[PDB]
C-alpha cells in the first residue's frame, strides 16, 4: 500500500563499476521498493538486464517489538538489521548468496536529515567460487544518511549517501598472488556513494558518483591474466550511474 510501501521502476546506466576483477558499463532494468512499517523498515531493489541481482535490507525494531523504549543519546531507535545479497550469475558457478545480520540504529542529529547506521557479521554461502564460500566471513559498517536540499526545475532535490565498510574477511589471506607478487584478493574492502536525486510526482532522476577501495575485495593493481593477456585489476576509483524511473502510487 502506498501509505508505507513505495515502489519503483528504473533504468540505469553504469559507468566504471568496480565490483569485480575488470571494469564495467552497464544498463540494465531495476526494481525498487522501500517500505516503513510501524515496527520494521525495508529497502530493497533487483537488477536485471537491459540475469538477476537483488539486494534486500529488512530491518525489525527491537524497541516495538521488546516494547521497551530502548532510546538512548542521539540514538532514536534499535534494529536487528539485515543487508542480504543474491546474484544469480550465469553458471551456478558465477553466483552470490551473502547474508549480513547484526545491530542496527537511527540517529537524532537535530539537523534536517536522516543518519542510519548498521553493523553486521555475515555468512557466505556462494561466492563466484571464491576461497571464503560457505563460511562465516567478515564484517560490515552501513553509514546512511539522506538530506532534503530544495525544490529544483518543479521537483524535488535531495541528496542521498551511503557507506559500506567491510572487514574482517579471510579472502586475500586464502587466495593466491598475483602475476604482479602482491595478493589477488583483501580482506577488506569499501564502497561509498553519492547520490544526487530529482523527484517528481512519479519521474525522478539521480546521478549517483560512487567509489571504491578495493571494489569486491579485488586487490588493487593485482596483474591477471585471463587467457586474453596479462591485465591490472583497477578496484580502487571512480564510477558513476545515471538513473531514471517511475514511483507508482494512487492519488
Do not use: C
Not at 571494469?23 to 537488477?47: Q, S
Not at 551511503?162 to 564502497?191: P, V
Amino acid at each position: 500500500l502506498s501509505d508505507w510501501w513505495h515502489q519503483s521502476v528504473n533504468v540505469v546506466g553504469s559507468y566504471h563499476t568496480r565490483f569485480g576483477p575488470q571494469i564495467r558499463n552497464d544498463t540494465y532494468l531495476e526494481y525498487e521498493a522501500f517500505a516503513k512499517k510501524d515496527w520494521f523498515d525495508f529497502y530493497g531493489y533487483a537488477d536485471a538486464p537491459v540475469p538477476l541481482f537483488m539486494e534486500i535490507e529488512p530491518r525489525f525494531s527491537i524497541d516495538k517489538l521488546t516494547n521497551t523504549d530502548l532510546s538512548f543519546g542521539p540514538f532514536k531507535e534499535w534494529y536487528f538489521a539485515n543487508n542480504y545479497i543474491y546474484d544469480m550469475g550465469r553458471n551456478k558457478d558465477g553466483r552470490q548468496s551473502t547474508w549480513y545480520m547484526g545491530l542496527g540504529t537511527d540517529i537524532d542529529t537535530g539537523l534536517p536529515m536522516s543518519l542510519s547506521m548498521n553493523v553486521y557479521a555475515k555468512y557466505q554461502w556462494q561466492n563466484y567460487g571464491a576461497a571464503n564460500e560457505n563460511e562465516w566471513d567478515g564484517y560490515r559498517f552501513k553509514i546512511k544518511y539522506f538530506v532534503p536540499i530544495t525544490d529544483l526545475w518543479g521537483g524535488q532535490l535531495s541528496y542521498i549517501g551511503f557507506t559500506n565498510f567491510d572487514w574482517g574477511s579471510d579472502l586475500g589471506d586464502d587466495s593466491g598472488n598475483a602475476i604482479n607478487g602482491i595478493k589477488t584478493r583483501t580482506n577488506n574492502s569499501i564502497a561509498s556513494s553519492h547520490i544526487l536525486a530529482l523527484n517528481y510526482d512519479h519521474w525522478h532522476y539521480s546521478v549517483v558518483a560512487r567509489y571504491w577501495h578495493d571494489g569486491g575485495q579485488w586487490n588493487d593493481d593485482a596483474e591477471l591474466n585471463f587467457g586474453n593477456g596479462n591485465f591490472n585489476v583497477r578496484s580502487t576509483g571512480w564510477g558513476g550511474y545515471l538513473v531514471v524511473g517511475y514511483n507508482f502510487h494512487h492519488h
